[PDB]
């Protein structure tokens, strides 16, 4: 349904791509302080409050999209 970078743990260089499940329709890449997340996501949860709570990161910047392997780290200014 959609292909995106999904690393179950924060890593500066997420390189593993997976065909996300039906449950997921969008993709997320976030930079919380010094940690970087990449995973299949739901567009309805592409808000500050949801990403903050679901990743346990007080301060962050995030990006959401719906194209294959779009959520690479160079999409956020850093």
């Amino acid at each position: 349904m959609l292909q995106c970078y999904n690393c179950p743990n924060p890593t500066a260089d997420c390189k593993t791509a997976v065909n996300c499940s039906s449950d997921f329709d969008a993709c997320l890449i976030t930079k919380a302080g010094l940690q970087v997340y990449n995973k299949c996501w739901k567009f309805e949860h592409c808000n500050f409050n949801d990403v903050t709570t679901r990743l346990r990161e007080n301060e962050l910047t995030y990006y959401c999209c719906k194209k294959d392997l779009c959520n690479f780290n160079e999409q956020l200014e850093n």
């Binding site: 567009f43 592409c46 500050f48 962050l60 910047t61 995030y62 990006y63 959401c64 999209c65 719906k66």
Partner: protein, 472 residues
């Protein structure tokens, strides 16, 4: 006469034409095109979008006007030629046979709703219709109040070519009293909407004769029609019915850049809430209205187009429901082919370049830290976006000076794009202390992108104070 009575289904049944092209208009084509540009004139930004599109309109109900009123009456005969497609049909003269007519109107029994006209002419059929109305207002005038059946067609004003396809090839001469700027629409300086209203009280319809000969006097020969142009290239039609009432063209326009304009105009037509302080109210409160009223009589134009959404509502109520017993005139007519008595349809097809407009207002946030202690800000916001292709994306942002150890009198102003969303501001304060070593003083979210926003914090390390102001 007889046997000679075979102009009917012998010349008028063997007529060869394609019912759906003989009355079809096409315009020269435009290859797909897309274009944009932005102003940045006011404090506003403004974007103008040009896009190729097509209008295909097929209607059977044709409009009555001054230039064609003399030729439009029930039972009249036309050729399905270029004159009809220009809404200026040419009469087929000929020694006509008697024809029967009928009218809606409530009441009437058996055949009292019908009348027979011996020599169908504009004058003669008119007097025959007036006489049939001259008396329903006698047996039933007091027994029934006849309302109007409202019908209208709305279209954005983009080009003359697309407006002709929407409203008729003769629209240029109807839309002169309407001072359509067009240039102002193409430059994004104006939005305009054109609406044609038709309030129908009653319609006079023709009783389909037994045979196509029944239409012409006896001893009318095929050659007699093959000499007045009636043929395969220009087959004949007759006015099936004619709607009586009141009609008008209305120009809605505004200098607003709001994208809810069309939806607000149409909501005003329909008589809806549009409530005190909603956005539809504020749009309609600045919409210029410009009406020119028509019909048979001779149109009449207007004067200087000065009106508002209220002028509209009055005319509706003034034309809706019966007028001063007036007809109030013929407003529409429908034609049918002599062959099979089926309703003819006119088809219009035109490409055009549409113009769309949009604008947002930049906002400012000023942070004045005139208080003790070390302040600290955490500001975020989301950028809703769409690539080419229309795919959506969200890119969140963070203030350059997020979490910087401020100090004494700190002041700064931040500039936000107008399309920012979900603004977020948190202010903390260093209190040299374990337990709550940072202490929140201001923590608000889902802020509104206002023109200006000022957040003034002061106080001491033990009781920080803070105030907030806005401005539009």
């Amino acid at each position: 006469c007889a046997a000679k009575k075979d102009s009917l289904n012998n010349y008028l049944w063997d007529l060869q034409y394609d019912k759906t092209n003989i009355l079809a208009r096409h315009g020269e084509t435009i290859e797909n095109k897309f274009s944009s540009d932005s102003f940045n004139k006011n404090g506003e930004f403004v974007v103008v979008e040009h896009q190729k599109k097509n209008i295909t309109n097929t209607t059977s109900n044709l409009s009555v006007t001054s230039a064609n009123d003399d030729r439009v009456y029930p039972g009249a005969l036309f050729r399905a030629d270029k004159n009809l497609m220009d809404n200026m049909p040419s009469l087929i003269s000929a020694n006509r046979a008697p024809i029967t007519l009928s009218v809606d109107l409530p009441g009437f029994h058996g055949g009292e709703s019908a009348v027979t006209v011996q020599r169908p002419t504009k004058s003669s059929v008119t007097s025959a219709v007036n006489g049939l109305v001259s008396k329903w207002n006698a047996q039933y005038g007091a027994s029934h109040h006849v309302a109007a059946r409202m019908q209208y067609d709305s279209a954005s004003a983009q080009s003359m070519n697309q407006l002709k396809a929407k409203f008729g090839a003769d629209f240029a001469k109807i839309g002169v009293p309407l001072k359509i700027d067009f240039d102002a629409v193409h430059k994004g300086e104006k939005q305009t909407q054109i609406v044609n209203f038709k309030q129908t009280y009653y319609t006079v319809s023709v009783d389909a004769p037994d045979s196509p000969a029944d239409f012409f006097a006896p001893c009318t020969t095929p050659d007699s029609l093959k000499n007045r142009g009636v043929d395969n290239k220009r087959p004949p039609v007759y006015v099936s019915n004619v709607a009586y009432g009141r009609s008008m063209y209305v120009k809605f326009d505004t200098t607003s850049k709001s994208t809810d304009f069309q939806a607000a105009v149409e909501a005003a037509i329909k008589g809806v809430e549009i409530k005190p302080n909603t956005e539809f109210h504020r749009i309609l409160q600045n919409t210029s209205v410009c009406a020119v009223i028509l019909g048979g009589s001779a149109n009449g134009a207007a004067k200087v187009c000065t009106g508002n959404i209220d002028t509209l509502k009055a005319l509706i109520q003034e034309g809706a429901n019966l007028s001063t017993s007036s007809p109030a005139v013929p407003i529409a007519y429908t034609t049918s082919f002599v062959k099979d008595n089926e309703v003819a349809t006119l088809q219009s097809n035109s490409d055009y370049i549409e113009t769309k407009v949009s604008s947002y207002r930049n906002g400012y946030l000023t942070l004045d830290h005139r208080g003790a202690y070390v302040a600290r800000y955490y500001i975020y916001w989301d950028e809703y976006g769409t690539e080419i292709d229309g795919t959506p994306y969200v890119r969140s942002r963070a203030w350059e000076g997020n979490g910087k150890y401020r100090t004494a009198h700190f002041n700064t102003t931040i500039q936000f794009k107008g399309n920012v969303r979900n603004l977020r501001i948190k202010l903390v304060e260093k209190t040299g202390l374990v337990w709550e070593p940072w202490r929140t003083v201001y923590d608000r979210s889902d802020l509104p992108l206002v023109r200006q926003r000022t957040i003034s914090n002061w106080g001491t390390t033990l009781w920080p104070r803070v105030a907030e102001t806005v401005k539009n």
